[PDB]
Design a protein around this ligand. Structure first.
Ligand code: HEC
Ligand code: HEC
Ligand code: HEC
Ligand code: HEC
Ligand code: HEC
Ligand code: HEC
Ligand code: HEC
Ligand code: HEC
Ligand code: HEC
Ligand code: HEC
Ligand code: HEC
Ligand code: HEC
Ligand code: HEC
Ligand code: HEC
Ligand code: SO3
Ligand code: SO3
Ligand code: SO3
Ligand code: SO3
Ligand code: CA
Ligand code: CA
Ligand code: CA
Ligand code: CA
Ligand code: CA
Ligand code: NA
Ligand code: NA
Ligand code: NA
Ligand code: NA
Ligand code: NA
Ligand code: NA
Ligand code: NA
Lengths: 519, 259, 519
């Protein structure tokens, strides 16, 4: 059985922890629940660690006293189709391969499934590690609890003897790098300096060998990503988000200085050897919008190229870990601000951005966000019980599964069927404009080889490439974004109409140029 | 927010608690979750209590770390028919009235329903307190969580100014006495001597005025009835059971000395 | 009422039947259940038939004493979508028309439906008989029992007066030939020599007029295809399968000589005029893997061309009735072994194979097959009854309809939802790779006219055509195969990655060659 340690002893050296722990709702929770510090206490000095204490990062460290939150978190939604490729006619982006050609997502981009699987899915997806990591067998794909207990309880490594990124299956890529992991786990929270900058106290950084890094990591979406383990207060831990909100002074709501002030973030830094090492962002309120924005944002987590001169931006560059913290209509300016693009299109040669699941930046300015609604109201509602102690559901999933606790809790004028119908109106309409944007994008793309081969000038091809950047951005935001318009229907509509406008302009440009070369 | 107390100070006087607490699965659980001992600790000696510390008996004391067990406990099974008299042709004993004539159960004997209601149902049944205690209104019969939070949040007393057992409704009895309560609550666990014998240190005993006793009690089936709050180990607290099993040497399984 | 005949009289001439009948589980079943031999017995001599006895081939001949097996067999699974074209964005092969152009399957290739309909569906499909045969009206499409009672109770013939294959509707083909029928019915079992070779005792052969042959046939999937009517023991009757397993010595499990020996097949030949005429394969065990392999295999059942010189291989050639009995990775070698291909692609001019539903060859080597699992365990499980006599369900259908009797009977650690989720993981992943293989195949195909028209050399076009053969094979196996990877997920994955590799190589080859012609 666990034996409590003398926290007063720890506090004599760890004054930041004392200030947080003694005052919050974990004041009675002994350090031994999460730390084995026996050898540490015997060897530390006032400002040198000595022997490293062992810190538990598994979610069952919290499940001990918070079974309901843990069990709702680990639930697998079997109705969320697993390993379902988005580049298929029945998924999000029927023409994805043509439009993304040149980018590693062509190797595989599946729909998201339940959070229990995030780290294992990151490890096994075809675009990430050259097929190096696989489930131990095909039965393991069902095992959410197993994945939560640890990725390496359910996966294998094709070659434990090597640490380089390479292809073990022919149609795979090696896109993963250490930045990715920040949005899959925080097991490395004590081994990773803020932003992944080089640091003598950091085992891991942006430039580490990702295969070696991968082997050190086990648990998905640690409970402490949103809740400080010492104060039990709401926080974020993601470096890129703290960088945008605090370092860059953009605020938690960049379009609303008042709301940003009322629902703000305080950056707290921890040091190693009296030098800044890592940071967390303590929240004024338990604001799920900002908590979920640790991952459900558009970001850089990869090498790329400069827009100005096409030169390589490698993992060593700060830009390889970046939250744009910009809506779709401010994105092009945000990418120019850091002089960055992701890939050159394999067919058109245009410099293009790669967009990632921008749910947070999309939700801004919606009628719901402006009315003070937050992700948890729809995706983590309070449980309603005929008799019992209320808690917050941690099964993050579509509101379709809990319409009474989500939509209908605020929309008393609707039946469940009416509220579902409202959702489907927006999603159907938005998906139609996504498909039409793809049609026009593809028509434009296919004209590039025809233009080049008819000897159309580089100047005209470059004008078309500029249009491609915009046609791409104003489309891809919405196949990347997971709500199919629901999070901000007016913005989806305006953006997708702009994509089509840009593609149409480029199609006309190229067709005319081709016809002139022929005549 | 709760602030932990120094349990080592408690242990300097409370050696039986130390032996249980330091070894079991609640070794990390601070006393302040269930005891307000600030004034006690300032005034006690190992031989003189001084100020009485306050001990929490409500089930939500355990529900903060054990929500799943608490929430499953307080669920109301609506299919367990409520207030259903057994002496009817469609229940357990169609000829109960004839057979039991002369006993207080003739006044009312309902089928049991969910544990959340045990204490309130004990208080309101027609055979128990002469109809003195009733639900505040007919809606409150559904409120299992309310009953668990405390009987007196959902019940009324027909005459707060008197403490004698008497009939407020014609066809009731006053069968209840202090022993009944031991199978409805253990809120009185520090105020009741073993078996309910007279004792200088007991507020309540077998010979107490049951109406006054009733007013001091709130929670049904406390979680600590089966789980020692200090060791977290399995236990019983009921005096009559310990008396049969241990004092009378009958054993937990009288028909099986090995078991 | 039926009157029993004296079997001793028959046995005096039919010693092979006596040896089988007297010893098996039909020893008490009188010949009159299936044979009207009155005139035969009056006219036969020791080795000349005399008058032909009438043999019942309808399934109700068995339903008499085996109602449960018959009634489960004839059940129509209404959830198996009927007449559903695979070349549609919501079915198996969204780009099928582009990829198969040149082949008769372009005229129509529907998903399979319940076995009751196999013969009528063969007769009415647009690719088979020029639209000659149709249901009597559109209501008849529901009538499984009616189709079982006889195809000609529910179909019509546009022209009873002619017997030639021709088009009655514009967008039909005349692909059917007599070999097809062997996988739809065995009503012809006494009128068809082994392999369909010419034989003076055979009414029908590979070279017969298929329209005339069609009119002689009535019943789907005769009960005796898997069960010898004389011994009641397990068997196969399909010539092509006996040829591969026995004549070619490949074994019932070609990758496993031990299992082949334990679960083998004995070829039994029946003669006419003391010359070999027909054959059956008696099974050592009631092994559904081999029983279902009578039809659920890749095969030739059609004319084609030689790979060596492009010359025609007609129905007269043995190769027009062939079971390759090879997995996807041994197939190209198996097709070269008989010097055969199916069609030339209409756009690329590549010689290509046509792949057919290779479930048996795919299942080989899977974790399930290696563990001794067989088709019936998932598709014909034993019925579980609270009280009753157990029998084998003959409703051959997806295990989704009977998860308790199929998957969960062996996988006790799973709920129904978890087992369905495991299936969907594999099918979703495999379908994504099918769709990507099609994308790359189509991109390659579309470059052929551009290359030809830019004057790219025949030598380069021929290299690309060689790549097309492989890109096609490693894709088409999986749109042909019905499990969408489930029967062998690792093999599906490796094959489909190989298809994409081959197409990519060809795309690069052609693009470079085109660009050089332009510059
Ligand atoms: C001074 C003699 C110390 C005592 C007493 C305790 N700790 Fe410590 N710890 C100390 C130092 C100088 C450092 C490096 C960081 C810093 O503040 O300078 C640490 C670090 C830790 C950590 C982080 C470990 C990691 O992997 O990065 C933990 C989790 C930790 N310490 C816990 C801890 C506990 C629980 C203690 C009481 C049992 C304790 N420390 C005492 C110095 C000192
Ligand atoms: C028992 C020994 C606990 C351990 C292990 C963990 N937590 Fe806890 N938590 C515990 C208590 C007694 C309380 C107070 C309950 C109350 O409302 O008074 C809490 C509270 C929380 C909260 C709520 C915080 C708030 O500001 O309202 C959170 C979000 C929380 N705990 C999170 C949490 C995490 C993430 C844990 C794993 C690192 C964890 N707890 C462990 C008791 C215990
Ligand atoms: C936070 C800013 C993230 C970064 C850094 C990475 N990922 Fe991610 N990922 C993130 C979210 C919010 C989601 C779910 C929403 C969605 O649209 O998918 C994901 C999902 C994945 C998945 C599963 C679905 C899929 O795309 O196949 C995989 C396999 C995945 N992510 C891999 C991955 C890689 C390889 C990364 C570094 C190049 C990476 N992720 C970074 C959030 C974030
Ligand atoms: C961010 C993505 C979160 C993660 C990771 C975890 N929790 Fe959480 N928690 C989150 C929100 C938005 C809320 C509601 C806040 C509000 O006030 O509305 C909570 C709440 C809790 C609580 C408080 C009691 C309750 O309302 O249920 C606890 C004790 C808690 N969460 C525990 C917990 C556990 C054990 C986690 C890992 C399984 C966990 N949280 C992760 C957001 C997030
Ligand atoms: C980084 C640690 C994340 C945090 C914080 C949040 N999400 Fe997430 N989410 C993330 C990933 C990598 C994935 C895909 C996981 C996979 O294995 O494919 C997701 C997925 C979702 C989903 C889809 C679930 C489904 O049934 O398909 C939803 C609805 C979702 N995420 C919502 C969500 C909410 C509301 C969050 C704040 C409370 C949140 N996520 C945080 C990564 C991360
Ligand atoms: C958090 C501050 C707690 C309070 C309040 C209560 N309990 Fe507890 N309990 C807590 C922990 C950390 C553990 C250890 C869990 C483990 O398995 O490691 C426990 C354990 C129990 C057990 C099981 C003990 C066993 O020997 O099997 C029981 C029966 C139990 N706890 C009961 C219980 C009761 C009745 C409480 C109210 C009086 C109570 N706990 C409060 C944490 C906390
Ligand atoms: C609106 C026109 C009502 C209808 C329909 C139903 N009830 Fe009602 N009820 C209503 C009011 C305004 C009140 C008083 C509320 C208060 O606390 O002041 C009630 C009361 C009850 C009670 C308690 C009666 C008592 O004597 O204590 C019960 C048991 C009750 N209501 C139940 C009930 C049922 C089951 C209904 C459908 C058959 C029903 N009510 C309808 C208003 C209205
Ligand atoms: C433990 C040995 C008990 C004693 C002392 C008392 N009761 Fe009881 N009671 C007990 C149980 C196990 C049950 C449920 C099973 C059953 O058969 O009822 C009850 C139930 C009640 C009820 C509700 C059902 C009913 O009979 O109407 C009431 C109203 C009740 N008990 C009252 C009551 C009285 C008045 C007691 C002292 C005279 C008494 N109980 C003692 C267990 C035990
Ligand atoms: C009644 C007059 C029957 C006719 C017509 C058919 N079958 Fe039969 N069958 C019959 C009996 C009495 C038995 C023995 C039952 C037993 O288990 O003892 C059988 C058995 C079979 C079997 C099981 C064979 C085995 O080896 O275990 C099969 C597969 C079978 N019968 C098939 C079958 C077929 C295909 C029929 C139509 C050609 C048919 N039977 C007719 C009785 C009768
Ligand atoms: C009475 C008002 C009818 C309604 C309602 C439906 N049907 Fe009908 N149908 C009706 C008749 C008199 C006939 C002709 C019957 C005959 O054999 O002469 C039909 C025919 C059909 C057919 C066959 C069409 C063809 O062969 O061209 C089909 C497929 C059919 N009916 C289906 C059908 C459906 C699905 C209905 C509800 C949508 C339906 N019918 C209604 C009379 C009536
Ligand atoms: C056994 C080696 C077969 C040969 C010879 C023929 N077919 Fe076939 N057919 C076979 C199976 C196992 C299936 C079901 C599985 C599947 O993938 O379809 C079929 C199905 C059909 C169908 C229905 C579905 C469809 O393709 O439209 C038709 C119409 C059909 N078969 C026609 C057909 C023709 C015309 C053949 C000779 C050229 C032929 N089949 C031969 C097995 C076998
Ligand atoms: C091959 C595709 C089959 C066809 C055609 C028919 N049956 Fe069948 N039968 C088949 C299998 C795989 C089995 C199970 C073998 C095992 O031992 O596991 C059976 C079994 C029977 C039996 C035996 C009793 C039973 O298990 O149900 C009988 C009597 C039987 N089958 C009858 C039967 C009938 C009447 C058929 C035409 C409707 C028929 N079978 C066709 C495989 C195949
Ligand atoms: C040739 C006589 C066959 C035998 C032997 C087996 N199958 Fe078959 N199967 C065949 C055809 C021609 C078809 C398509 C029929 C049509 O009209 O379209 C099928 C179909 C199936 C299916 C699909 C059923 C559905 O609901 O869609 C399944 C699941 C199937 N076949 C399985 C199967 C099994 C397990 C067999 C051995 C017991 C088997 N088939 C034999 C042709 C023939
Ligand atoms: C007994 C006759 C089985 C039937 C019916 C089903 N499965 Fe199976 N399966 C079985 C065994 C003995 C094994 C190997 C177990 C081991 O760990 O050694 C399996 C394996 C699987 C797998 C993993 C495949 C792989 O890793 O390559 C899966 C995904 C699986 N089984 C699923 C599954 C499904 C969905 C079933 C119904 C369609 C099913 N199995 C039936 C034994 C048997
Ligand atoms: O503790 S040391 O720094 O004197
Ligand atoms: O690649 S992750 O960002 O979806
Ligand atoms: O029967 S004849 O052959 O003599
Ligand atoms: O044409 S049949 O083989 O599907
Ligand atoms: Ca999903
Ligand atoms: Ca991006
Ligand atoms: Ca009851
Ligand atoms: Ca089907
Ligand atoms: Ca073929
Ligand atoms: Na979904
Ligand atoms: Na869809
Ligand atoms: Na095109
Ligand atoms: Na009951
Ligand atoms: Na009853
Ligand atoms: Na189907
Ligand atoms: Na479909």
């Amino acid at each position: 059985n666990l034996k409590p340690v003398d926290a007063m002893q720890c506090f004599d050296c760890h004054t930041q922890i004392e200030d947080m722990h003694t005052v919050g709702k974990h004041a009675t929770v002994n350090c031994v629940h999460c730390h084995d510090a026996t050898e540490h206490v015997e060897t530390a000095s006032s400002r040198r660690m000595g022997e490293r204490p062992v810190t538990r990062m598994d979610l069952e460290a919290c499940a001990t006293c918070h079974t309901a939150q843990f069990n709702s978190f680990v639930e697998v939604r079997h109705e969320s189709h697993p390993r379902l490729e988005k580049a298929t006619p029945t998924s999000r982006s029927p023409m994805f391969d043509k439009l993304i050609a040149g980018h590693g997502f062509a190797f595989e981009h599946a729909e998201p499934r339940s959070h229990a699987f995030m780290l294992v899915d990151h490890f096994v997806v075809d675009r990430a590690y050259g097929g190096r990591f696989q489930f131990k067998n095909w039965q393991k794909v069902t095992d959410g609890m197993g994945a939560v207990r640890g990725a390496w309880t359910v996966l294998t490594d094709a070659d434990p003897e090597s640490s380089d990124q390479r292809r073990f299956l022919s149609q795979t890529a090696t896109a993963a790098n250490p930045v990715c992991l920040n949005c899959k786990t925080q097991d490395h929270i004590l081994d990773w300096a803020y932003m992944g900058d080089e640091h003598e106290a950091a085992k891991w950084s942006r430039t580490s060998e990702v295969v070696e890094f991968a082997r050190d990591l086990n648990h998905p979406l640690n409970c402490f990503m949103c809740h400080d383990p010492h104060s039990a207060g709401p926080r974020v831990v993601r470096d890129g988000l703290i960088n945008a909100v605090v370092d860059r002074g953009l605020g938690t709501y960049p379009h609303d200085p008042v709301k940003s002030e009322q629902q703000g973030m305080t950056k707290v830094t921890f040091q190693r050897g009296r030098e800044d090492f890592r940071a967390i962002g303590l929240l004024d309120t338990a604001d799920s919008n900002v908590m979920c924005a640790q991952c459900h944002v558009e970001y850089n987590c990869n090498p790329g190229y400069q827009l100005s001169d096409g030169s390589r931006v490698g993992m060593d560059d700060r830009r390889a870990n970046h939250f744009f913290w910009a809506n779709v209509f401010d994105y092009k300016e945000a990418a120019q601000e850091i002089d960055f693009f992701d890939f050159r299109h394999a067919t058109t040669g245009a410099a293009l951005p790669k967009l990632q699941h921008p749910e947070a930046e999309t939700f801004w300015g919606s009628v719901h966000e402006r009315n003070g609604v937050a992700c948890a109201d729809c995706h983590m509602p309070k449980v309603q019980l005929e008799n019992g102690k209320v808690y917050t559901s941690h099964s993050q999933r579509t509101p379709r599964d809990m319409m009474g606790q989500a939509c209908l809790n605020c929309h008393a004028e609707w039946t469940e069927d009416q509220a579902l119908y409202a959702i489907d109106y927006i999603k159907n309409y938005t998906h139609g404009k996504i498909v039409k944007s793809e049609y026009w994008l593809a028509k434009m793309i296919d004209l590039f080889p025809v233009a080049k081969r008819a000897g159309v000038s580089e100047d005209v091809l470059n004008q078309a490439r500029e249009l491609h950047y915009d046609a791409h951005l104003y489309w891809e935001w919405w196949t990347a974004e997971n709500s199919v318009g629901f999070h901000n229907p007016d913005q989806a509509r305006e953006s997708l109409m702009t994509s089509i406008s840009k593609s149409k302009e480029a199609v006309s440009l190229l067709n005319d140029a081709i016809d002139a070369q022929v005549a």
